[model samples]
Target: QLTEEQIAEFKEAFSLYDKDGDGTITTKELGTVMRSLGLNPTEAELQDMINEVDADGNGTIDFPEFLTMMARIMK
Candidate 1:
């Protein structure tokens, strides 16, 4: 389970990648952020991550979905 502080921190990170201010983070955006952080993630790998967590089948990640992804992975 994630704490409130963790949620706040995640929100900050999520917003950074939600560049369009669309309240959803796209795979490209996530890839950009990860690359900026020095992690070289392949397009397919990022797509896989989204595929696992995109609960609404929207093909993009919203904050709630992001949170769930974090929590599940954090375990």
Candidate 2:
């Protein structure tokens, strides 16, 4: 289980990644954020990642999507 601080950190990171304040993260936004975190994902890789976890088909990643991905990655 995530602590409150951990969840807050995750939310802050997610918000930073969700540029344009749209509450969703596009491939470009994810790429930029990932790059900032020192993970450089190619466009194709980004699309594949998005396809894997973007549940709503909104062309952007929501909080749940990000949270799920983060949990998996942390494991």
Candidate 3:
């Protein structure tokens, strides 16, 4: 449910937080990602957000999982 261009763009953004290039966004990096995007969630809210974007329930956001998150919010 995403265009190729859109996916490419998302991949660009995703890689910034993918950091070590292990190929996933971990709970360890969530706050940095949020803050980079100008988010200001509180402690509890941040935990809630972690619960929100993690699709596979695996505690990290892979490329596909990140894409699912983008799909749900794309306007």
Candidate 4:
């Protein structure tokens, strides 16, 4: 489980990725988010990550997927 503050901060970061405010994070937007977080993943790695979290195979990450990913990292 995540702390309230953690969830809030996660939402803040997620919002940063959800650029169009459509409640999902595209690959390009995720690149920005990762870079902002001090990560420098390659395009291949980025797509791999999206594939890992994209349960529906829609090629984007939704809030639930985002939360799962962040929570795993938090652990």
Candidate 5:
């Protein structure tokens, strides 16, 4: 389990990822985040990554979805 501090850090990171301030990370915005971080993943690669956390199948990841992914990874 993550400490409270780790959870807060994750929350901060997720807010950054929600670039448009719309409270969810869209697929295209995912590309923006990856590229902004100096990673050049192809569309196919990015889509694959997004698909993993897009629990609602809505082509976007809200905070809850992101938390779920972070929790799984932390484990």
Candidate 6:
């Protein structure tokens, strides 16, 4: 089960990624969020990361996408 702190942090990070507040994190938004975290990934790297999580091709990362990405990073 996920802890409250973890969920809160995830929500905060997710919000940061959801730049437009339209309920999704697009590739551009993802890049900005990652950059804010000091990750200067190339377009290829960012695309790879997005493909790894955005399984639905929705052009944005939902909660499930965020959670899956977080789990991968934690591991």
lDDT of each: 0.86, 0.85, 0.76, 0.87, 0.83, 0.80
Model 5 C-alpha lDDT per residue in residues 1-75, reported as the tens digit of each score: 769998789879898788778887876788888898899988888878888888789877888888887788879
Please provide, for model 3 over 1-75, each residue's C-alpha lDDT reduced to its tens digit, 9 standing for 90 to 100: 859997778878788778888897765677777887887767666667767777778866788777777778885
TM-scores for the candidates: 0.73, 0.73, 0.67, 0.73, 0.71, 0.70
Residue pairs with colliding backbones in model 4 are none
Q: Look at candidate 1 and tell me the lDDT of residue 62.
A: 88
Pull out the clashing pairs in model 5.
Answer: none
Model 3 scores a C-alpha lDDT of: 0.76
Per residue, candidate 1 scores C-alpha lDDT tens digits across 1-75 of 869997789978778889988798888998998899899999999999899988999888988888787777789
Local distance difference test, candidate 4: 0.87
Model 4 stretches astray by more than 4 angstroms: 1-10
Which segments of model 3 are wrong by more than 4 Å?
1-7, 42-44
Q: What is the lDDT of residue 35 in candidate 3?
A: 80
lDDT of 2 by residue, 1-75 (tens): 769998889979888888788787888997887798888788999999898988888766789888898889889
> Which candidate do you rate higher for TM-score, 2 or 3?
2
Residue 9 lDDT in model 3? 88
Residue 42 local lDDT, model 2: 89
TM-score of model 4 (CA atoms): 0.73
Question: Model 2 — which ten-residue stretch has the worst lDDT?
Answer: 53-62
Question: Model 6: residues >4 Å from true position, as ranges?
Answer: 1-6
Instruction: Return the TM-score for candidate 6, rounded to 2 decimals.
Output: 0.70
